């Protein structure tokens, strides 16, 4: 809230990777399924945030959380029961919490 506007563009070139949410399962650990195109780019132990989630609005209104990828399109999170009931929609995006200018083990290096 407003912080989105009042926040540093610290995300340098890196924009959050966003994915289409297929379904979210009200369970703990919570498990959700993403669209085949929903190439999330999320990493196990990575942090993500949600948007446009229906029913499970808690995610929309929740800070980013740690996630664990069960499969390529299936990931698991804290407790969906601590969110709400999933209706439809839902956009999920990874948020690698802001870092000080530093060298972190980058994701599989790009080949060109």
UniProtKB/Swiss-Prot annotation:
Location in or out of the cell: Cytoplasm; Mitochondrion; Nucleus
UniProt induction comment: May be modulated by the thyroid hormone receptor.
Protein modification: ISGylated.
Expressing tissues: Ubiquitously expressed. In testis, expressed in A spermatogonia and spermatids but at very low levels in pachytene spermatocytes.
UniProt family annotation: Belongs to the ubiquitin-activating E1 family.
The protein's role, per its UniProt record: Catalyzes the first step in ubiquitin conjugation to mark cellular proteins for degradation through the ubiquitin-proteasome system. Activates ubiquitin by first adenylating its C-terminal glycine residue with ATP, and thereafter linking this residue to the side chain of a cysteine residue in E1, yielding a ubiquitin-E1 thioester and free AMP. Essential for the formation of radiation-induced foci, timely DNA repair and for response to replication stress. Promotes the recruitment of TP53BP1 and BRCA1 at DNA damage sites.
Note: There are two active sites within the E1 molecule, allowing it to accommodate two ubiquitin moieties at a time, with a new ubiquitin forming an adenylate intermediate as the previous one is transferred to the thiol site.
Quaternary organization: Monomer. Interacts with GAN (via BTB domain).
Name this polypeptide is given: Ubiquitin-like modifier-activating enzyme 1
